[PDB]
RNA sequence: AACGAGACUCUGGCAUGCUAACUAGUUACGCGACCCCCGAGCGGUCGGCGUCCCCCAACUUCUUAGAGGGACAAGUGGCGU
């Protein structure tokens, strides 16, 4: 057994998926022949490996985002989460009130609106 | 109303069904190719216990048989294979008439003309090439060719004029006219590589698809972009109907049969829904072809089966 | 980032696919010769036994050695963050 993939495979596998993302299928044989044309792998046995790992990565890339390499459409959805989230447009719900000892600060700083009072019991853990 | 019932399913392969075709001369035959490196000729009993038995099995290839097509007489049959060669069968016992020698890479697509005198080939050479029935090269196309692999070529039925379709992975569809062998036109469209193309039985249309999975319609002689339809994730094979203006689109979990007039989906064919997870819970459908009756259609899958359906009113 | 490990080279295991062979074979007859009726028949012929005859025959499965393809944890079910 054994046969844990080396770094020479994992380095180029990531690269080949980033710049030829479109050409990929999810079949072994198709992904082999693409790697043969978009690059030269100087061995035959090495080629049969790099294809198989390119296949095995492409399975996971069709789920959530991989943390070793980037593709375009994930950076799209990244941007779409990072410019507005549907949760709020209001700040925060527009009116939030506070309890005393905060009101005393506001009293001495010329503010006197939009408050509630509750004088919660003593004390820490008690 | 015209709807679909699950007819039955055939068995007799160790490799994924790549193509299926049927001659209208004998609709009681049906022909198949597969990645078990053999093309199987069937014997169709119409019993619902089975739906057919393999009659003979044509043998002799060292790599996959990609596409297969029948003769107009039904007495010959031809194959294109990923060993870089083609064969010309005599579908009565076996015994290849001719093997066509010369390609440096796979022969993906292949088609057989109406007059039975011109045979074309798409290759990962990035060359369309023409072939005499004697097995020699009438012409080779290496100028104004695709810059990527040739996905599928077609002979066009016409009034008499010579026109042949070509489409590659360079996201273009080239139409060629013989006896100058020039670009009739270039059609641009589809993001991502093109899988397939097919021509209407009347012959003025090219329904194309690919990685995009959208079905764009082109005009052969007008040269106009009619419209586009959302055909799902990916469409690997297409086939018009012989007795209707429908179009049957092969997507992964389902086959989408579309009425064209008006433009709407009739039904979606679902097969067995057996519990499996998670990347392709059913096998992808990859090829499909109508019978000349137009009642029954067949499908190629990657579980090594050909599922049959039938139209019921 | 580098050396060693791996990658690499050779060898074995998979080709009725490809390439081609009287300093390699097979098959087919043409055979005529020998042999025994040994089986149907009569001893001939048909069938069986090897050798000589073999070609301007056919073929390359066997033998030979070259170009290629094939195996990747590839697919499925468990398990592992």
- Cα angle, residue A109 at apex, residues A103 and A110 outer, rounded to 5°: 90
Tokens 């070793």 locate to A68
Torsions phi, psi for B225 (to 5 deg): -90, 100
Alpha carbon separation from B272 to A59, B14, B253, B257 (Å, rounded)? 23, 20, 10, 18
Protein-contacted positions of strand C (CB under 7 Å): 5-9, 15-19, 68-78
Residue B1 covered by a domain: no
B108 to chain A: nearest residue by CA?
A: A30
Alpha carbon separation from A57 to A17, A72, A112, B113, B284 (Å, rounded)? 9, 16, 60, 42, 20
Distance (Å, whole) CA B120 – CA B101: 13
- Cα angle, residue B183 at apex, residues B122 and B80 outer, rounded to 5°: 10
Distance (Å, whole) CA B39 – CA A108: 92
Of B181, B155, B9, B139, the C-alpha closest to B78 is B155
B193 to chain A: nearest residue by CA?
A: A23
For chain B, the distance separating the N- and C-terminal CA atoms, rounded to the nearest angstrom, is 5
CB B87 within 8 A of CB B73: no
Residue B123 covered by a domain: yes
Distance (Å, whole) CA B108 – CA B58: 19
Torsions phi, psi for B107 (to 5 deg): -115, 110
Distance (Å, whole) CA B68 – CA B127: 19
- Cα angle, residue A34 at apex, residues B195 and B280 outer, rounded to 5°: 60
B94 CA – C48 C1', rounded, Å? 32
CATH of the domain at A43: 1.10.60.20
CATH of the domain at B164: 2.130.10.10
| Sheet strands side by side (includes B163-168) | B150-155, B163-168, B172-177, B182-188
The residues near A20 (Cβ < 8 Å, ≥ 6 apart) are: A34, A38
In total, how many domains does chain B have? 1
Centroid of chain to Cα B274: 28
Task: State the resolution, in angstroms.
Answer: 3.0
Q: Which two tokens stand for residue B200?
A: 């209407």
Alpha carbon separation from B246 to B6, B8, B201, B217 (Å, rounded)? 19, 22, 12, 13
Residue B260 covered by a domain: yes
Residue B106 covered by a domain: yes
The residues near B258 (Cβ < 8 Å, ≥ 6 apart) are: B215, B229, B246, B247, B248, B249, B264, B265, B266
Q: Which residues of A touch B192 (CB under 8 A)?
A: 22
Full domain range(s) for residue A55:
7-62
In the PDB record, what is the listed experimental method?
Answer: cryo-EM
Peptide bond into B138 cis (omega under 30): no
Full domain range(s) for residue B95:
7-313
Residue B2 covered by a domain: no
Of B76, B31, B81, the C-alpha closest to B56 is B31
Q: Which residues of B touch A37 (CB under 8 A)?
A: 124
Peptide bond into B164 cis (omega under 30): no
């Amino acid at each position: 057994m054994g046969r844990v993939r080396t770094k020479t495979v994992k380095k180029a596998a990531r690269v080949i998926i980033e710049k030829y993302y479109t050409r990929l299928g999810n079949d072994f044989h198709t992904n082999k022949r693409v790697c043969e044309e978009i690059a030269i792998i100087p061995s035959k046995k090495l080629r049969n490996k790099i294809a198989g790992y390119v296949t095995h990565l492409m399975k996971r890339i069709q789920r959530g985002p991989v943390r070793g390499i980037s593709i375009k459409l994930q950076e799209e959805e990244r941007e779409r989460r990072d410019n507005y989230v549907p949760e709020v447009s209001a700040l925060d719900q527009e009116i939030i009130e506070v309890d005393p000892d905060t009101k005393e600060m506001l009293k001495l700083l010329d503010f006197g609106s939009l408050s509630n009072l509750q004088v919660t019991q003593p004390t820490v853990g008690m | 109303t015209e709807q679909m019932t699950l007819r039955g399913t055939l068995k007799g392969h160790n490799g994924w069904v790549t193509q299926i075709a049927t001659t209208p001369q004998f609709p009681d035959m049906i022909l198949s190719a597969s990645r078990d490196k053999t093309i199987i000729m069937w014997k169709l009993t119409r019993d619902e216990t089975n739906y057919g038995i393999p009659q003979r099995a044509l043998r002799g290839h060292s790599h996959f048989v990609s596409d297969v097509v029948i003769s107009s007489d039904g007495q010959f049959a031809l194959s294109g294979s990923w060993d870089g060669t083609l064969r010309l069968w005599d579908l009565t016992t076996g015994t290849t008439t001719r093997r066509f020698v010369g390609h440096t890479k796979d022969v993906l697509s292949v088609a057989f003309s109406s007059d039975n005198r011109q045979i074309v080939s798409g290759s990962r050479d990035k060359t369309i090439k023409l072939w005499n029935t004697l097995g020699v090269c009438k012409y080779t196309v290496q100028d104004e060719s695709h810059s990527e692999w040739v996905s599928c070529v077609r002979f066009s039925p016409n009034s008499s004029n010579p026109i042949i379709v070509s489409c590659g992975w360079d996201k273009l569809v080239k139409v060629w006219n013989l006896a100058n062998c020039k670009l009739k036109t270039n059609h641009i469209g589809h993001t991502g590589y093109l899988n397939t193309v097919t021509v209407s039985p009347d012959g003025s249309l090219c329904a194309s698809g690919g990685k995009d999975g959208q079905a764009m319609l082109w005009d052969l002689n007008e040269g106009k972009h009619l419209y586009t339809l959302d055909g799902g994730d990916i469409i690997n094979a297409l086939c018009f109907s012989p007795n209707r203006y429908w179009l049957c689109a092969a997507t992964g979990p389902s086959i989408k049969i579309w009425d064209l007039e008006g433009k709407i989906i009739v039904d979606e064919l679902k097969q067995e829904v057996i519990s499996t997870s998670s990347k392709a819970e059913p096998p992808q459908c990859t090829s499909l072809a109508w019978s000349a009756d137009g009642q029954t259609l067949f499908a190629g899958y990657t579980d090594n089966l050909v599922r049959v359906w039938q139209v019921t009113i």
